[PDB]
Each structure stands twice: as structure tokens, then as C-alpha cells.
Assembly symmetry: C3
């Protein structure tokens, strides 16, 4: 009967996640958890911070996930670098694993950096803009 042990384990996990959620330390959406260290740095620096914590730079794949990151962007009053970069072909973006981006939420007219804006930033309203990768942006990670 590890079930009773499994019940206790599940209970305690919900407790810790409950505490972190209640205190605004993270946002849970489906099986994904978003969180920020509150720091504003560039793309490469964000990537390192997220991977060091055992996670990855956040990327929304659903409207719900997009709205979650947006709320964090809104809360900290800063744009957010997302986990995707531009191919050699302008207008085409891929996740960091190489896969083609599916869900998008570009601000009207974007992307239009003409291949000179490799990264993607999220505005506080949740819409996307392709941008240079060297700006100071809120570090948001997914786990």
C-alpha cells in the first residue's frame, strides 16, 4: 500500500504549490509553471538563469499560457523575451529545440524586423513583437 504514501505525497506537493501560488511566486497553467526572478536582462542571460533553475525561458503555446505570461509582464511593467528565435528566413521563427512555432500572437504588422530582429518580446497586453536580443527584458521561466 504505497497508495496512502502516494496520497500524502500528492497532498504535500499541492500544499507547497498552493503556498507558492498564493504568494504570487509562480503561476500554474495546466502542467506548466511560470515564474520570474524579477530581473531585467538580455536573451542569453535569461536562458542561463532559467536553465540554471532547471527550467527554460518561457514560451506560450496556448492562449491561456500567453495570458499567464502577459499578466506577469503587466505586473512587473516590462516586456518579456520569449523562448523562440528567428530562422535564416525572415518571418519564420522556431522554438529553441528547433521546432517550428505553432501558436502565435503577433501585434498587428509584426513580425517585420526584416530578419534583423531575431528575438521575440511580449508586450504587456500579451501581443508579440520581433526585436533585437540585446535589450533588458523581464526574465520569465517555465518549468
Amino acid at each position: 500500500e504505497l497508495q496512502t504514501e502516494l496520497y500524502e505525497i500528492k497532498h504535500q506537493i499541492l500544499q507547497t504549490m498552493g503556498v507558492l501560488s498564493l504568494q504570487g511566486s509562480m503561476l500554474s497553467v495546466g502542467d506548466k509553471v511560470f515564474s520570474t526572478n524579477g530581473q531585467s536582462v538580455n536573451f542569453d542571460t535569461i536562458k542561463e538563469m532559467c536553465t540554471r533553475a532547471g527550467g527554460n525561458i518561457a514560451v506560450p503555446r496556448t492562449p491561456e499560457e500567453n495570458e499567464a505570461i502577459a499578466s506577469i509582464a503587466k505586473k512587473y511593467n516590462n516586456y518579456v523575451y520569449l523562448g523562440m528565435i528567428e530562422d535564416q528566413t525572415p518571418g519564420d521563427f522556431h522554438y529553441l529545440d528547433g521546432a517550428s512555432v505553432s501558436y502565435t500572437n503577433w501585434y498587428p504588422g509584426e513580425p517585420r524586423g526584416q530578419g534583423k530582429e531575431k528575438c521575440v518580446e511580449m508586450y504587456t497586453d500579451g501581443t508579440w513583437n520581433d526585436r533585437g536580443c540585446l535589450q533588458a527584458r523581464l526574465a520569465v521561466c517555465e518549468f
Copy 2:
């Protein structure tokens, strides 16, 4: 041998709970965890905050649990709305699931709102007072 996997899992849970406890993010009493977002709002707002985090507005059922919530009330220097409301019959209170309240810690003379004070607040010394549900009170949740 999932036991060794279960040992690692139990260890990591204790670590995270240990960290949260050490930094005062929550209080553990038996199988119950209490926590606050530090905010002072009304009863309905507290209920929503707690349920959104996957928990419930706190309610003590033992002296130990009561003292835990009291310490939080004391720390934040504010009274706490508890998870119970008054029936149609004055003087009789029930938990939010409908069940009759068992453990009580009324301040001497309370409850005496004559049915016009549906909610229950905890003083910083841990004693209870029946009160209106529209005041600004420290949000404390249980998980």
C-alpha cells in the same frame, strides 16, 4: 524498486517545505499548512484567493491549529476571517461545507451579534468574534 524513487521524492518534498517554513512563507501543523498573501480584504475576496491557490480560507479545528493562525494574525498585526459562517439560527455557526462547528475559541461573551454578524474573525490573541463579512481582514489560507 520504486521505494528508492519514493525516498528521493519524500526527501525533496521535505526540502521544499523546509525552505518555505524556514523563510516564514507558511506554517505546518499536522497535515495542514497555513499561509497568507499578506493582503487585507473581505470574506468573499479571501475565499476566492484561497480557492484560486488550490486551498481554502483557514479554519482551526484544534488548539494547535488555532494558535498557528493566531501567530500569523499576531505577526501581521491584523484580525483574520475564519472559514465559517452563521446559520439562520443566531449563535450557531457552520464550516463552509455545511458541517456544524466543533472546536471553538470565542472571546468571552461571543458570539453575540444577534444574527447580524454572519462571519467570524480571530483576534491577535487567538480568540474569536462574530463580525460582519465586509471588513478588511488578513487573508489566511489552509492547504
Copy 3:
């Protein structure tokens, strides 16, 4: 098939640990987690704080663990009491379980308290110094 349940459980644990790590609430090194409440008190007080959180006053047993505690000492700009005390024989130190200390990182010339410095403090560079147990030092716990 508790495996799928075990996968979910492992995932959620990594999420919570990821959040705590990302926000600097703790440092993970191997199977050990270090954390501080930011408070500066004496040896006996630290011991109580750590055990109350279900952990123990930190003690490094590897260079990696030592560097982790050092970074915390460096961050909070304060020396750290470590989990060991001196025997009746000067120069010989033991962990709190009684076992003889193995890994050491004494500052050159230390320990030289001549048996009048029972405790051990860590400098911000990570090196050790034997010291009296009544000073105000950063409380760092391991879990």
C-alpha cells in the same frame, strides 16, 4: 501504472524546486539544499531555527557544498556558523552527530582558538575560522 502518477509527481517537485531556486530562496547542491532566513543570531538559536524547519544547521562536506554556503555568506555580507563544534581536545572538531569532521577549509593558521573557540564560522571567501558560539551570524540551514 503508478509510473505516470510518479512522473507527474516528479515533474511538480522539479517545478517547485525550480521556482524556489529561480527566486534565490535556496541553493541545490547534489542531494542537499541550503537556505537562509536572512537572520543573524547565535549558534544555539540557529540550531533551533533549522530543526524547527525540519532541517539542520548547514555543514559543507565537499568543495562544491562549501562554495554554495560561501555564496550565501557573500550575498548577505555576513559570516556563517557551521554545523560543527570543538571536542575537549583543542584542534579537533566534530559534526553535531558526534562524527569526526572530514572535509575542512580552514583559513591559514586556523583553528587556533586554543580550545576557547568551540564553534566554527565561515568567512565570505569560504574559509573557516574557529570562534566563540555567542556571536551574531547568518543562519544557514541544510535540508
